[PDB]
Design an enzyme around this catalytic site. Structure first.
Site, mmCIF file in Angstrom:
data_model
loop_
_atom_site.group_PDB
_atom_site.id
_atom_site.type_symbol
_atom_site.label_atom_id
_atom_site.label_comp_id
_atom_site.label_asym_id
_atom_site.label_seq_id
_atom_site.Cartn_x
_atom_site.Cartn_y
_atom_site.Cartn_z
ATOM 1 N N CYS A 32 56.022 44.608 32.362
ATOM 2 C CA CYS A 32 56.287 43.474 33.235
ATOM 3 C C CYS A 32 55.348 43.493 34.451
ATOM 4 C CB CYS A 32 57.782 43.462 33.632
ATOM 5 S SG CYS A 32 58.238 42.671 35.254
ATOM 6 N N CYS A 35 57.241 43.245 38.120
ATOM 7 C CA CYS A 35 57.949 44.515 38.340
ATOM 8 C C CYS A 35 56.992 45.543 38.971
ATOM 9 C CB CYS A 35 58.495 45.071 37.022
ATOM 10 S SG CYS A 35 59.599 43.978 36.116
#
Length: 108
Positions: A32, A35
Site C-alpha cells: 500500500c 500506508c
C-alpha cells in the site's frame, strides 16, 4: 521499532483492547503506497505524543483476523481507541499536520 507497538491477531486484545489509555491503531499493508507514506509520520507522532497515547501497527496480511471486526476496507485506516473503545476514524493518507488536528481534537 522503539515506541510503536507491533500488533498481532493474538496480542490485539491485550495490547489494544485492554490498554488503560488511548491507542492509535494503523491498519496497513506492505504493498500500500499511502500506508508507507504515513509510516515515517507515525514514527514522529509516537515521539511527540508520549504519555498522551501509544501508536500501534497492524499489518493486515500477516494479521488477517482483526480487520474484519472493525469493518475496515480502505487502507491505511487509523483508529483511535480509548480504553478499548473506538472514538474516531480516519481513512487514507494525511500529513503530520492533518494527523495532529485529528488526534488533538479527538483526544480531548
Amino acid at each position: 521499532s522503539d515506541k510503536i507497538i507491533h500488533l498481532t491477531d493474538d496480542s490485539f486484545d491485550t495490547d489494544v483492547l485492554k490498554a488503560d489509555g488511548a491507542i492509535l491503531v494503523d491498519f496497513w499493508a506492505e504493498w500500500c503506497g499511502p500506508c508507507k507514506m504515513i509510516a515515517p509520520i507515525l514514527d514522529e507522532i509516537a515521539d511527540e505524543y508520549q504519555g498522551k497515547l501509544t501508536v500501534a501497527k497492524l499489518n493486515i496480511d500477516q494479521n488477517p483476523g482483526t480487520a474484519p471486526k472493525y469493518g475496515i476496507r480502505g487502507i491505511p485506516t487509523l483508529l483511535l481507541f480509548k480504553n478499548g473503545e473506538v472514538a474516531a476514524t480516519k481513512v487514507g493518507a494525511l500529513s503530520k499536520g492533518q494527523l495532529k488536528e485529528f488526534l488533538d481534537a479527538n483526544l480531548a
